[PDB]
Design a protein around this nucleic acid. Sequence first.
RNA 1: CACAAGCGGUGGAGCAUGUGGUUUAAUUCGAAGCAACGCGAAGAACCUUACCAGGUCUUGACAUCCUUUGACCACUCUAGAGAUAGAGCUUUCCCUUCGGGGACAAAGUGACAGGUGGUGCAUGGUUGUCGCAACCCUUAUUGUUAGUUGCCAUCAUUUAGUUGGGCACUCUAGCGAGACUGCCGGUGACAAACCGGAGGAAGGUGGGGAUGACGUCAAAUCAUCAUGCCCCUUAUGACCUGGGCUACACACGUGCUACAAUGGGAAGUACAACGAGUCGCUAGACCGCGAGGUCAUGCAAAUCUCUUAAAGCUUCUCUCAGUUCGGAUUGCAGGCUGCAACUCGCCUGCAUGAAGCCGGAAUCGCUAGUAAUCGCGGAUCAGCACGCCGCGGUGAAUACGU
Lengths: 60, 154, 110, 99, 78, 128, 204
Amino acid sequence: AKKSMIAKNKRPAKHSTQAYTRCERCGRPHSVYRKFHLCRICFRELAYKGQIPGVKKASW
Amino acid sequence: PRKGPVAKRDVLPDPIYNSKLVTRLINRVMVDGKRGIAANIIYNSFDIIKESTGNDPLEVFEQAMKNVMPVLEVKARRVGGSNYQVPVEVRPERRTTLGLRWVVNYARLRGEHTMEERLAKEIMDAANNTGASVKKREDTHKMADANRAFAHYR
Amino acid sequence: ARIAGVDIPRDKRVVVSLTYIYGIGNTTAKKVLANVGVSEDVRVRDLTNEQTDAIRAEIDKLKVEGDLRREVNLNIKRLMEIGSYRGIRHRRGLPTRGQNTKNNARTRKG
Amino acid sequence: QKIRIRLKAYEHRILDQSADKIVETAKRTGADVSGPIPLPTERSLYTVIRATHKYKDSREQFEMRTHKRLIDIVNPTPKTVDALMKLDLPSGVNIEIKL
Amino acid sequence: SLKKGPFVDDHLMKKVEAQQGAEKKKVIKTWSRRSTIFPSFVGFTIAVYDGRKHVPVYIQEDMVGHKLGEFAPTRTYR
Amino acid sequence: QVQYSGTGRRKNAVARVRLVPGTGKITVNKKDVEEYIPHADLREVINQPFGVTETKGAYDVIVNVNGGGYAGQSGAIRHGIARALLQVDPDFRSALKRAGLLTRDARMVERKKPGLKKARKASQFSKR
Amino acid sequence: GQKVHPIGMRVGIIRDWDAKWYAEKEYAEFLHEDLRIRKFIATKLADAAVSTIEIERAANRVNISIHTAKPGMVIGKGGSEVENLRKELNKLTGKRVHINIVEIKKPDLDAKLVGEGIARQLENRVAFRRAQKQAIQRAMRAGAKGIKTQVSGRLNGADIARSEGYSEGTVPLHTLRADIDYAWEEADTTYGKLGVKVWIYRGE
RNA sequence: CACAAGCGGUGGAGCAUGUGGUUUAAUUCGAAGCAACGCGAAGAACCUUACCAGGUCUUGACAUCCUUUGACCACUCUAGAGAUAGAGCUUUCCCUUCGGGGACAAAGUGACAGGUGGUGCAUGGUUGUCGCAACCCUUAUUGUUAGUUGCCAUCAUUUAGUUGGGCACUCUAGCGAGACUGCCGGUGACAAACCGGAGGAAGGUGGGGAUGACGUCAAAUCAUCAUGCCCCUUAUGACCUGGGCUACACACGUGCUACAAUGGGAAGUACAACGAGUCGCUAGACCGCGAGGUCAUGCAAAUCUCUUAAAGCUUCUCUCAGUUCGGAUUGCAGGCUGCAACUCGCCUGCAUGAAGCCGGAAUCGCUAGUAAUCGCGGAUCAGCACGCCGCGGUGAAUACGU
Ligand SMILES: [Zn+2]
């Protein structure tokens, strides 16, 4: 079930400590960055294609 | 390694006595990279040596080193499924390596209330042909010059 | 005999020998010895019979005796005889605080 | 001194280009513009697992640098205000003029 | 540690206030295992849902600071 | 006055040293070098350039140091003192050059790699 | 999985970001607005063969530019289609938008165009061996240092999957100053999905 | 670093955590020699949540169409564990040529929706494992351009780099230089290459990163996402409260703390770097033994704060003991976040004071600022780290040989 849960995520929560983040492309609930609102492996996918401005591969 | 022999790891002679041997002795006492503690220990031990029935810490230390270092070590080897042991000579750096190693190891196991009361006492006992370090040397010389039997044509 | 309950050891300072009575830890010994004015001086108990009675009369104001073991015992006793989830565990030799029993009972169950 | 700029960007090429634009069009009509002083270039770091299901022990790391540049203007004139608040190029560079 | 007043639920406290008059009934059936045992719960018989059933628990006096969940376990070992 | 200035770097620490004729002494950050680096004997590492060249006095040394640890910012002080001595007379660039005392030590802290416990220490393994 | 994305290895070295704006404290909203935009305008792209799209933005206006190979069939008769693009994009972004349409030259030398075209033959029951061959033939005639193609999946609409491609000229991948291009598309004939990849080397 | 030479471990003890096994109403699903087992999970009290027990709905929690049409609400009060139902002010034309279109509740109305259900042996995509060099990044030296919020050498001044002054020095960051067997000696087929020297901050791919060919294991993943075929459809779909995911006769892996004097305790004195901050980081003053609390202050940041680092050094103790070592377990009293800490959080104080005196067979990591040891920051996040990613401080032993 992953189409009712995205709907249930966007309605206002029943208590303060009941809201939680999800990805915005997919609905992945684990390991989302809250500066981009993207999950672990949409970040690595849109960093290539140079769409996220800023981000690039790091080496030092 | 496999390619061939390697360098020798130059050391920096300590400034107090200007003697690279005291540097290696400081490096062997030190544990966990706490070097100032090792330095304090060696200097207190030498103060204890000179103050009590001493002449100079370098002299008695060199003599103790001379009395402990080995001159005939054996190597246990494998041939084709049966293993033995054979004596061989001993190159110089290995000699001082072994000497320092034994002295520190057997001072660490003394049983007094300070590493200095152990180190000074042990290298004094060593500069007078006594102490488990000298007995370790003689165990080595006795293992050699006996196990030359199955070493005579190795 | 010695100064409280039984047998405060010899040869040690008072701030440490006073630990040996059930109910006196380390800061409690400090506070007791400070409400009177007794120091250690130096690594021995060479007190006076005024110092012993001094440090004896003040311990009476605490629960340092087999009057404390009674309290602890009857506490666990009240626990195990109502419901009780904590007492149920007290009766099995199992951790009574929530401890994910995979190894954490070798202390609690040997 | 009662007028000063701040410019942030992700590319020092565009950054220096626009800084020279403003400095040139400022000293053309006035004088005494303090140089484009460089600031210490913040950096961030993002580590991510590069596989969808397993294998934690192989990762890929990203970053995002943010270059900074400072310009202070000394003794403006009723023409510098005009000739400054009008030039606007380019797109992805932050400009923030505080008195 | 709710030193800003202990915690009951309104439904539970409503029911107990309503029966506070006369001799009491065993039908106080609430889920509510987070509530503490106020000193007025004595003598009643609360039914505490343990995830599967409604266990009854008789409130003596020694149980007066604990919670209602401490008297209805959930695991079923041996 | 006349003075001589040099800059010394070692392992995240940078020092700014000043040579000034005097009677032989060194103060760092408005304190005495006996108290600032009172460890045991690092001072006998600091006074080495005077020991090898321009033997051996007399200059008061004033330094400004910041960064690193107590053992890094003494090798840095030594570096700086040597450079300043070089500045006094260029004829010293041989005796100093023979005994090190003129080069920067480029031994920095190696960076940590992912999947490893440290820069090079790996996790514990089990063939089965 | 043992190759890096060739236009993510090179971003920030010799090529630029396809999204050039700087914002802080309004960054998530902007990124998802760009995603929405770009995921919408794949409507006309279904026929008009667009390749890239560059989003810039100002105080409250959003400057857009799209690279296509069909200028008239994307703007209208006298300008009756860009009108609709703007009046539709305003309904999403709630801002002012200004499309500045570019036109692409030499369209056979573009990774997305080539691969998307030679992934439309596979749907019309065409054999793959000559689709890729004619693709690299009409990519070399435009003048290119090298090209490489690859199709994957259930080939011929058959059983267990395999893969095969063809190469022409050199395509150096490890050279950072190389200016290579890349794209990955999909299609079906009747069975599952297929993956078509294409690399073109165009000097540096 | 495959053995050999070494240094420190694991296996013994307590605790944290993952897995098997058993148990259960459920202990959700995936990973299985190297290449599964602090792995997906970079955050299980409710949520997350797929699992279980009770209470509920059926064109539907979510999308399009067509018609009546059209502006939908939110707020208050009783019943209820809530889901929901019953009553109260009312969802009320924003285009008008008098003739239409956007948002939307209900209904009808069925096309239809919905599935973390199966098949990684039907697939795309994304990884693991065996495992050219240069162009790019960072670190080691310096010229020049620019001196604020950085810096203070030549001057007065105060609590002080603070305020007048200055951009010398350090620093920050744009653009350039510099390392090429490039010179000098020997070996060697005079060749490639190797050994030694000069000069220089650096010498022989200076140190480290990114970069992973053709292929191998029908290796991993329908549970990130897509998707061919099969299956469910008043239920395998959907809403709510409470419970597992944390159960414990045991077995295996990865870690943390110790078994003390190179130590434990009390007082004083020092020295970093990477990063984070607006309803966030908290200066300062006071109250509390403490964790903390109150009034208040600067800062959207080289300006203020998190942030006086810990090992270190100097004094005074303690004396080889299951102990002034060790800190498991239990009793009582508090604090903080949160609607709420029983199952099942972190922290504080007083009391208690377990095993453990260096660990067999066997087995692991590492070639230099490395091993060993010591702290600091942040992603995720109300709260919650012995795990993960980075940063710097002190700083070794050895490599005869295949
Ligand atoms: Zn995602």
